[PDB]
Amino acid sequence: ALSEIETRHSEIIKLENSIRELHDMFMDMAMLVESQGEMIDRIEYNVEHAVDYVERAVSDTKKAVKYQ
Amino acid sequence: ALSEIETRHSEIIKLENSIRELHDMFMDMAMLVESQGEMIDRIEYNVEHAVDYVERAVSDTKKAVKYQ
Amino acid sequence: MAGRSMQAARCPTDELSLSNCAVVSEKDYQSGQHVIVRTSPNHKYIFTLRTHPSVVPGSVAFSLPQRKWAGLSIGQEIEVALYSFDKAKQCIGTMTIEIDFLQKKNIDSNPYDTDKMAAEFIQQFNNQAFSVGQQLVFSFNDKLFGLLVKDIEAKIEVGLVVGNSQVAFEKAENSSLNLIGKAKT
Amino acid sequence: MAGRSMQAARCPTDELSLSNCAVVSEKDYQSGQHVIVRTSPNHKYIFTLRTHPSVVPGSVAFSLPQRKWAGLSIGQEIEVALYSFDKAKQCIGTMTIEIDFLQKKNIDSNPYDTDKMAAEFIQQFNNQAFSVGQQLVFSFNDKLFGLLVKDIEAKIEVGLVVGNSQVAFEKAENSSLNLIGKAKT
Amino acid sequence: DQLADESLESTRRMLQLVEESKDAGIRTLVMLDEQGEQLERIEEGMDQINKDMKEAEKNLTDLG
Amino acid sequence: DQLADESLESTRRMLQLVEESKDAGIRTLVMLDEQGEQLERIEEGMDQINKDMKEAEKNLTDLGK
Amino acid sequence: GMDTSGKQAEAMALLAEAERKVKNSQGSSKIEEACEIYARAANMFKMAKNWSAAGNAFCQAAQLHLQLQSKHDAATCFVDAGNAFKKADPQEAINCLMRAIEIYTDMGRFTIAAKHHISIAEIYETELVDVEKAIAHYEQSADYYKGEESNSSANKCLLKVAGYAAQLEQYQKAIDIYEQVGTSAMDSPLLKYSAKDYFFKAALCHFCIDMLNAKLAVQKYEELFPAFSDSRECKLMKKLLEAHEEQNVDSYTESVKEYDSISRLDQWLTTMLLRIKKTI
Amino acid sequence: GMDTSGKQAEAMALLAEAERKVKNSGSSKIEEACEIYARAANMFKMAKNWSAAGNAFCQAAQLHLQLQSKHDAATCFVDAGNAFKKADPQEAINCLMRAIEIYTDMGRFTIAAKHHISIAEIYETELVDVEKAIAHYEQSADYYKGEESNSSANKCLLKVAGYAAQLEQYQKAIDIYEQVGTSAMDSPLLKYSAKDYFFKAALCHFCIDMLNAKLAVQKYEELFPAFSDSRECKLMKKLLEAHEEQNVDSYTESVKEYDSISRLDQWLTTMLLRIKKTIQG
Amino acid sequence: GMDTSGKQAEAMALLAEAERKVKNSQGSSKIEEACEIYARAANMFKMAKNWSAAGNAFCQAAQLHLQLQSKHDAATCFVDAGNAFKKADPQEAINCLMRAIEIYTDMGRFTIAAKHHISIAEIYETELVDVEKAIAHYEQSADYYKGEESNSSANKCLLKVAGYAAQLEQYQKAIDIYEQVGTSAMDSPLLKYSAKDYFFKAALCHFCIDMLNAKLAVQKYEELFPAFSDSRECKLMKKLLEAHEEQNVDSYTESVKEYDSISRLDQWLTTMLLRIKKTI
Amino acid sequence: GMDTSGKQAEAMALLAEAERKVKNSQSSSKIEEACEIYARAANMFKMAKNWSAAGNAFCQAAQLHLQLQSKHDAATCFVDAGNAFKKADPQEAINCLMRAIEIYTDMGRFTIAAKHHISIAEIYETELVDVEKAIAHYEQSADYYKGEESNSSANKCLLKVAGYAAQLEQYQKAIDIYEQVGTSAMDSPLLKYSAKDYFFKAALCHFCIDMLNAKLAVQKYEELFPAFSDSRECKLMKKLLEAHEEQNVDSYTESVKEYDSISRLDQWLTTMLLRIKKTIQGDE
């Protein structure tokens, strides 16, 4: 037993504890990544709207004012 | 005897290989996350610049056409 | 007979819990009546009612064995309708009941009068309905026994026990109970 | 000479590498001169020059022992300044050299005449500059050995060898050399 | 022996846990790649927006 | 007997690897938190600019017509 | 009631005012004002959780914007109407999203069409329990995404298409898609570790046609790059093949159970393994 | 550098100028006055005072309100709320509520949801009114769910469920926990987490009566098979067996053994103590 | 149904009428309408899977739009034409992308010229099998990025440049770049963990020139970065140096195989080790 | 072409043209053209690798924008000039960044001022090694970030300033900072796991003052945070405390050596442990 048994048990238990902590960390990380993905998705649309609005407005107003 | 003996010698190498693979995955993930962080910083700067210029121009046209 | 929506509750007091019956409010029924309780289309069970001075109207209380047999959850909705038993064709003459100790605390090898116990059964359980597979508790000289209905003789699925019915006991497998009496086989 | 910048190159041939004399270009100097190669501000090592055809002028070729002693890498910048010996104090009378096997493959238990090799040493590098701490190779009969200068007796750090050098050799650090003769201690 | 049986069971649990962690890591990597592509698109759109707006100010200020 | 010693060495190497992985995980978590805050800060800017542009456009249009 | 009743009352009032103004106009400012109040009424409906009326109002505003010479606003109103209708009756949601997709693709924007096609396919699969049209929509979305060199989205859509097609007994298409994705993802240093999965699935499909195809394909895949020869999955494949060669089903069941014990199986894998077992 | 004295003096000068400008009241006067109010508020926020900044922002918001502009009033109200965040909670609540009222009129639902979550954090961190926190979280969850943002409408529901479990309303917590577990089960990414919620549901059941816990555990194992091979299900089975014979030593032994490998937060320990005291008797 | 018959017919009709309208102009509204029609026709052709027509239409629109004072739109059309042409004939894509890059840099926007250079480099390497111009483009992009303190992207570009330069037997450049990147990454909280790898690579290059240089460089990097003294790579380097010091190829191969077993070597490492072993 | 000579010559000619054009103008409408030509000259210089002239041109453009009634453009030109000068003349970079910070904070925007303050502190620490000014700038940035409800950035800045303060033998200041962050990290779902580390560092600072303050602080953290008890750092601290009490320098050295062998330490930890070692050795 002696060193053999003591190393066996202690190292095994410590390894298991560390593995469990890693498990928890990764679950939380994945949830955070999901939420951020949805925020990015919502930003994209509001950027496209603004692009179309500005382009159309500038074009039309320029034409109208030059014609006047 | 040698049954349970060869078992550990083959229950250890699997763990070694899996752990090394996890190591490589995490290194690549960290590099990617850093690059995305810098991209986000640039996007924020551009957004703030654009919003402030838009406000200036809109207020300018508003007062200019108010005084006509 | 038409059926109403009633709610399962916890049986009041221990004595009513050892007195096998579904407990109801004094405003609706009395004791000795027969009802069928439906929790789903495919499993319905017949019970006899008893009134208690604590039952809240709109609920029916059951003891632990009845809930463990019928698979009922406290607070779940069930339907109960009065049921009318024939007496000319379903009357039980003799039954087979498997018996064992209810409380593991004190197993013993002493002899138990299976005859006297059977008579006490009639004393306590006369005029109550029993079905195959139903589980119950039996109080005999301050001892708790678990009983399981094995067979019924007039074969009938449900019947009304009469005063002169005879009960036979047989030790459950993997038990040290030494039974000695007429109620054996 | 003045300390101009040179570059270390590879020994042109094996024979010149074994000669223990730094190969140089025929256009720059004449054989027999000495140069205290200056690398770091606190690192200068004395080497003797010998010309050989080929080699591009402006570089100095060294054998593996020289590069491993002075710690030079091919392509590195070095300073070459000429050196003058002080015959009144630098003249080497005796020198102490530690000897050991160079190649573990050729280990053998045969006897080694310590005196017979000594004369060959004189025959080889007579009149050539040697410095304390220098490492070199020794070509005994079909034997490649590693030599390390530990001490010099007329103590000086650098001197010019002569023909009266009775170098006593002694094995060290688990060496298997079977040494015979009177040229030991 | 029997304590080595405990240890064999321990190794088995370790192996299962590491496999699960590996799957989670792989999925996270894929998710990050997709997000990176979306970030690229947003950045590309932004610049256009900025320039198109500054042109308008200039032309209409020259007009006024 | 001496091949068991190898087990000990393997176990020590595994433990070191696990510690390194844990530290990497901590750093990744912190970085993700900061990035999330930045994304939140950007959403609001986008909203405000969109609103302002729309309003001003309607204003110009009506004014003219 | 409380908020619900008053919000309903104001919504009906706004609808009545809109009808009054449209019948009055039958100018341009009248139509603009009517569309504005239509939108406000729809928003007020959404507060009280009455989705049908919200969709009706949004579609009416979309039509009003259509008759007037404006398009993007019509697209926005149509897509919002579809999203609102996603609760009660999916058919109208499909119709509205189709109109929005047509309008968007006309102008030359191909990113948003992919999103709307994906949403339509999700509705089709989840509510109408029909998979052919899901396949069509996913393929269209994959094509649009790949058009702009956004590879990852194309890969995701094609993986879904391949899974559904393989479920429906059309194997060759699934094999082609799996080969393409597996070989493409192998090169990239990031996704290198997942490729071993895709090849595995391809092999299973080959094994549903005939054993010899499975053996040849396994050999070819192992040749294509050696990491796939890791004992983990290739061992299982070889054992399954050998068990099927000698008409021994007990060994097959034992091997599958042993692999299952260490790691649970998914419905897809269990179904495919059951078919392979049966044919034996 | 300049110290709060000079900044406060300049802020007071700006406030006096704005007040006199509004006194002689036209559009130019009011616009200039609101501009001065904004500048003074910024200077105050630089001065580290936190109440005069709120007052300035609120006055500017009221001026923008009386003039026919809305968006600007909302922005000034939210800024005033952020300023009061540290000065006085109740004024912050009022300002944020008015901002949400203005926002929700024009259909900007997500912003209203965020502001609701902020009012809720206020009510739960400094004030002790949990009921209002539950109401606000429910409203935010509904607003998010209305836009198909399922991924951000599941945090508010979990917080609501936890607070309702603390209050002893167990049916609501059970319903929410099950629903969320069933929703997350299907998605491949979130699957690994689902195991938690089901466990947390069973405990709630076990608070009412043991038999309900037995039946619920059976139902969840049938519905979802991986649950049957985790460690939480082992502990549940062990406790349900142990507490059927009034044997508290086994109960505490199992709890301590589980605690050793992994520590338990406050919620779990409170629930376990409730269960032991109530039922094990 | 998305058949290309009607799509092609419409596209050709639009192109023909645009050519007619532009031809009649022997004031500038004709150019504007013609350019808009050209853009619509290009999008139509792109829908039709015919990419060459899309490229031609886009380039014509770009030319016509650049004819006017407006230039910010020529850039955009040119980049779009390049994306389109990236399928059939890469040579034109290079020309268009370069004409774009030129305008962008002239305007003062440097961050969005590096991206186009990276794209051109990818085209060159993947299809034209030429590496000198790839190196040139990567170097230029790295310079532009490092101008704007975007260190990470500059590091990635320099890594690719160093890899190819080492591939082409220009060792000195590779070693300089690798040591620069290693030292820079050593001083960071996150990248720290990867910092070992680069050093290992550098050591290998030092080996190709001469063994002793490699020995001294390993000593230097171990002293500079103590955590490097325990990693696997340093141990492997020590063993290979000792094996190569005594004309012992056997132990060299044994160590290489032992290190291969745990982790699979890439093409780069295996080719470099093969060169080293071919030396002796 | 890539030729630098032609590009620089063109830049010089264009800059001279702009100079003479503005000088003629001085003899508003033309000032705009002067600004645009200055910006083009600056960009050309930047592409010509002559960073000094690029910074100078940007500064001139900013000055031209200031006299005209525009500010935001002046701020943008100042920040560009600072980024350009960063490589050659750090002092002018700091000057330009400070002016831009003043303008920005005057206009109302705050976070941008925090970013520029962080940049100024970074340049101070990397080039002129003036630690006190770096501490001042970091504290100002943290104040702004915390005033705008952004917590993570404020925490990062506070950690940096605390590290330098401990470096400069101002122990008390560092300790409070660490404790604050620790409590915050205790009340979070994610950061919880790292929260021990901060506590550990705080303990070491106490040990520098007195060993009994350190023991009491360890007890306080133990009762406040029980998870801290299992971790290695608590065991190491208790063993070191005992060894210091008993005066057996050898046990302290051996224990620290073993802990180092298991894992390496940063310069900060090694120097702090060395200071404690030197303190204890005098006792023996």
Numbering used by the authors:
A (entry chain B), B (entry chain D): 191 to 258
C (entry chain J), D (entry chain K): 1 to 154, 171 to 201
E (entry chain C): 19 to 82
F (entry chain A): 19 to 83
G (entry chain F), I (entry chain E): 0 to 25, 34 to 287
H (entry chain G): 0 to 24, 34 to 289
J (entry chain H): 0 to 26, 35 to 291
Give passages from the manuscript.
To improve the resolution of the spire reconstruction, signal subtraction and local alignment were performed as before. This approach improved the reconstruction of the spire proteins to 4.22 Å, enabling docking of a crystal structure of the 2:2 syntaxin—SNAP-25 SN1 complex into the density, which was of sufficient quality to assign characteristic side chains, to identify the SNARE domains, and to determine their directionality. Furthermore, we were able to reproduce this result by reconstituting the complex with only the SNARE domains of syntaxin and SNAP-25 under non-hydrolyzing conditions (min22bin20S), yielding the same spire configuration but to a higher resolution of 3.86 Å following local reconstruction. This reconstruction also reveals the interface between an N-domain of NSF and an ɑ-SNAP molecule in detail; the interface is characterized by a core hydrophobic interaction surrounded by charge complementation. Four ɑ-SNAP molecules bind the 2:2 binary SNARE complex, with two SNAP-25 SN1 SNARE domains and two syntaxin H3 domains. Regardless, these structures are consistent with the notion that SNAP-25 SN1 is a critical initial mediator of SNARE assembly.
